[PDB]
Design a protein around this ligand. Structure first.
Ligand code: 1EU
Length: 180
């Protein structure tokens, strides 16, 4: 369950700010890049202080695996990036795989929208988007530190030469691009 994360968030993340939540989502995108599948990772800091991370990798698995009765993506989000889900007022996950666009959404660590096919796309159009709204009640400050995000993303870009990383800050109206 995710209740224990909500009871003691500081046992699971840096509760100073939601930056570490951001890093966890970023790490998963970067992993797809390191695995050789993603060529671009975009991060967007929205005006409402929610963070959105998108990669053009293979897309999180949406199928139901033998043994499991629930879509892989749901397990990934709910089975203890599940910490991000636990500590967010809302999380929206969208996946492009197999020429279909899939959506699923959570609030307060609980699913509020079943995995649903909501569109179609090119066969080569693949990737994962995670957009989350941290619950301010778990953090000393709800504000993402922009400098900390930039240090992190510069660090990831150098770790993955050839992968493009972008950061769009819709609060301060800047965009940065790295590609080493
Ligand atoms: C915005 C965060 N990005 C992200 O989570 N990307 C991403 N995350 C994943 C994962 C998991 C487990 O998180 C698995 C596969 C994957 C692995 C094997 C075959 N097909 C897809 C692909 C992925 N791509």
């Amino acid at each position: 369950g995710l209740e224990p994360v909500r009871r003691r968030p500081g046992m699971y993340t840096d509760t100073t700010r939601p930056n570490h939540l951001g890093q966890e989502v970023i790490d998963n995108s970067v992993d797809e890049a390191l695995a050789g599948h993603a060529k671009r990772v975009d991060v967007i800091l929205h005006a409402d202080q929610s963070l959105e991370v998108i990669d053009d990798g293979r897309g999180m698995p949406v199928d139901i695996h033998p043994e499991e009765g629930v879509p892989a993506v749901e397990l990934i989000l709910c089975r203890l990036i599940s910490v991000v889900n636990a500590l967010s007022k809302r999380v929206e996950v969208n996946v492009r795989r197999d020429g279909q666009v899939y959506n699923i959404a959570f609030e307060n660590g609980e699913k509020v929208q079943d995995l649903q096919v909501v569109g179609t796309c090119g066969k080569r159009n693949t990737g994962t988007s995670v957009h989350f709204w941290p619950d301010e009640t778990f953090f000393d400050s709800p504000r993402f530190s922009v400098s900390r995000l930039t240090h992190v993303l510069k660090a990831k870009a150098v770790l993955c030469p050839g992968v493009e990383i972008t950061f769009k800050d819709e609060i301060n109206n800047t965009e940065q691009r790295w590609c080493y």
